[PDB]
């Protein structure tokens, strides 16, 4: 059966405060692993039809040595998105996150999101992760990851 557990590529995490689609994950390193699925720049492609369980864990962190978080409005979010190489538009499968106040006097701020779902996937369909504040992403392999594993067949 096919599966995937992709941890964040710590050396290729985008910068800025705008929402982006993450385009770099590990696939064969540490806890990162992939089988009978293909990965191309943050797009985990399904090679075999079936019902998969999709999950994602996203950790945001900020230390005071990096400066200060501006605008005061802070909404740390994660969207698990299903794209396709036949239809241009993409669609959210799962959504998670929280508005936060990180304007305190503490030296470190941390927050993690977790999402999980049972979805019907066809070959050719692709799963991708997009986050709100990539500059706040935790590069740790136990912190920021997303994955999938087949449970049943479609028939």
Partner 1 sequence: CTQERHYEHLGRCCSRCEPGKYLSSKCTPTSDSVCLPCGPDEYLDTWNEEDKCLLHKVCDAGKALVAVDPGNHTAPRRCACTAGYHWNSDCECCRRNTECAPGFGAQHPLQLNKDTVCTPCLLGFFSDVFSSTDKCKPWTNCTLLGKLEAHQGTTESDVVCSSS
Q: What does the binding site for partner 1 look like in residue numbers (CB under 8 A)? A: 10, 17-19, 28-31, 61-66, 73, 75, 77, 79, 86-87, 91, 107-108, 110, 120, 122, 132, 136, 138-141
Question: How close are the terminal C-alpha atoms of the chain, in Å?
Answer: 15
Q: How far is the CB of 48 from a copy of itself (least distance, A)?
A: 13
**How many CB atoms are located within 10 Å of the residue 143 CB?**
18
Residue found by looking up tokens 């999402």 in the block: 115
Rounded to 5 degrees, φ, ψ at 64 are -70, -20
How many CA atoms within 13 Å lie on the side-chain side of 109? 19
**From partner 1, a copy of itself, Cl ion, none, interface partner of 115 (C-beta below 5 to 8 A by class):** a copy of itself
Gaps after residue numbers in the chain (C–N over 2.5 angstroms): none
| Candidate list 63, 95, 120, 122; residue touching Cl ion; CB under 5 A | 120
Q: Which is nearer to a copy of itself, 27 or 33 (CB)?
A: 33
**From a copy of itself, partner 1, Cl ion, none, interface partner of 132 (C-beta below 5 to 8 A by class):** partner 1
Binders of Cl ion in range 11-50 (CB under 5 A): 26-29, 31
């Amino acid at each position: 059966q096919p599966f995937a557990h992709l941890t964040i590529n710590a050396a290729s995490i985008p910068s800025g405060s705008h929402k982006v689609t993450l385009s770099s994950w590990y696939h064969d390193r540490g806890w990162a692993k992939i089988s009978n699925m293909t990965l191309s720049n943050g797009k985990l492609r399904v090679n075999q039809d079936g019902f998969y369980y999709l999950y994602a864990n996203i950790c945001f962190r900020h230390h005071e040595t990096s400066g200060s978080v501006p605008t005061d409005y802070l909404q740390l979010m994660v969207y698990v998105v299903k794209t396709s190489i036949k239809i241009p538009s993409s669609h959210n499968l799962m959504k998670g996150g929280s508005t936060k106040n990180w304007s305190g006097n503490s030296e470190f701020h941390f927050y993690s999101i977790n999402v999980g779902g049972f979805f019907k996937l066809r070959a050719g369909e692709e799963i991708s992760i997009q986050v709100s504040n990539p500059s706040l992403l935790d590069p740790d392999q136990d912190a920021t990851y997303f994955g999938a594993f087949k449970v049943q067949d479609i028939d």
